[PDB]
Amino acid sequence: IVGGYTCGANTVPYQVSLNSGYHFCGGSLINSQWVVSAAHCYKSGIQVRLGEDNINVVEGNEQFISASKSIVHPSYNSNTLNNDIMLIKLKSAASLNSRVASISLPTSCASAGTQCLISGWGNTKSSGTSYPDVLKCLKAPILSDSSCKSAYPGQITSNMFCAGYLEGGKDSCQGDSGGPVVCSGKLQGIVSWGSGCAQKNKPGVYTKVCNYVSWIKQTIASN
Numbered sequence: 001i002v003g004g005y006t007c008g009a010n011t012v013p014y015q016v017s018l019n020s021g022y023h024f025c026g027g028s029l030i031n032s033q034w035v036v037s038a039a040h041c042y043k044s045g046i047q048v049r050l051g052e053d054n055i056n057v058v059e060g061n062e063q064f065i066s067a068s069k070s071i072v073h074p075s076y077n078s079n080t081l082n083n084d085i086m087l088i089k090l091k092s093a094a095s096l097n098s099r100v101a102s103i104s105l106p107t108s109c110a111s112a113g114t115q116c117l118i119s120g121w122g123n124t125k126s127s128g129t130s131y132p133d134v135l136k137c138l139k140a141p142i143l144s145d146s147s148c149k150s151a152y153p154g155q156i157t158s159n160m161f162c163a164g165y166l167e168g169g170k171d172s173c174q175g176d177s178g179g180p181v182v183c184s185g186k187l188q189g190i191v192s193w194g195s196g197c198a199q200k201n202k203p204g205v206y207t208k209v210c211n212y213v214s215w216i217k218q219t220i221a222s223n
């Protein structure tokens with residue numbers, strides 16, 4: 001996250017860190033046994049870290065649980081990043097408390113202009129590299145589809161939305177992938193891709209969650 005602020009320990013209780021010996025992607029807890037992340041974050045041997053603030057310090061409210069099953073969306077296309085969403089089932093149920101909570105699925109899509117909260121442990125520099133140890137937050141509006149498509153001709157599908165600022169300076173970035181985009185209390189997006197970070201006229205691109213609720217609900221119920 002570029003140009004955001006320190007969230008504060010456990011202010012985003014549904015935020016998950018995917019670890020394979022190090023942090024490599026964010027995720028969202030949707031219930032005691034399931035996590036939603038981006039398909040491009042798929043790896044074998046994932047450990048889900050819940051209740052995290054500083055990812056390099058054991059602060060006391062963490063739960064570390066291995067993944068038993070990973071399910072990449074059936075139509076995920078690694079070339080276009082169309083349908084960039086995956087579900088991760090935990091080995092054992094997480095213990096929900098004030099620091100570890102689930103986020104609800106939307107009952108409808110959100111309008112352009114709606115303010116969202118994006119969070120992650122990704123790079124905080126526009127051009128350069130600096131990774132934070134603590135969770136970073138950013139408030140950003142969903143952009144009109146026409147501005148999204150104008151920034152990335154021929155690359156935006158109906159399963160994607162842009163959020164951010166056209167003027168640059170504030171965005172998600174490498175390390176934030178798979179992380180939540182919450183608008184009006186519902187998970188509306190997943191950090192997917194971009195062109196650089198916080199660059200002018202290059203907003204962040206996010207998986208549009210509202211198109212996947214029946215797939216999510218049906219998949220979890222059968223696994």
Ligand SMILES: N=C(N)c1ccc(O)c(Oc2cc(C(=O)O)cc(Oc3cccc(-c4ncc[nH]4)c3)n2)c1
Pocket residue numbers: 079080081155171172173174175176177191192193194195196197198203204205
């Ligand atoms: N500014 C952001 N909001 C943002 C969010 C997450 C990131 O990881 C990110 O940074 C990057 C970094 C690269 C890279 O170094 O190769 C690729 C990428 O997008 C890709 C990667 C792979 C494919 C594509 C692609 N294919 C066709 C459309 N887009 C884009 N995103 C930026």
Ligand SMILES: [Ca+2]
Pocket residue numbers: 009053054059134
């Ligand atoms: Ca801390």
Ligand SMILES: [Ca+2]
Pocket residue numbers: 052053054055056057058059062
């Ligand atoms: Ca920690």
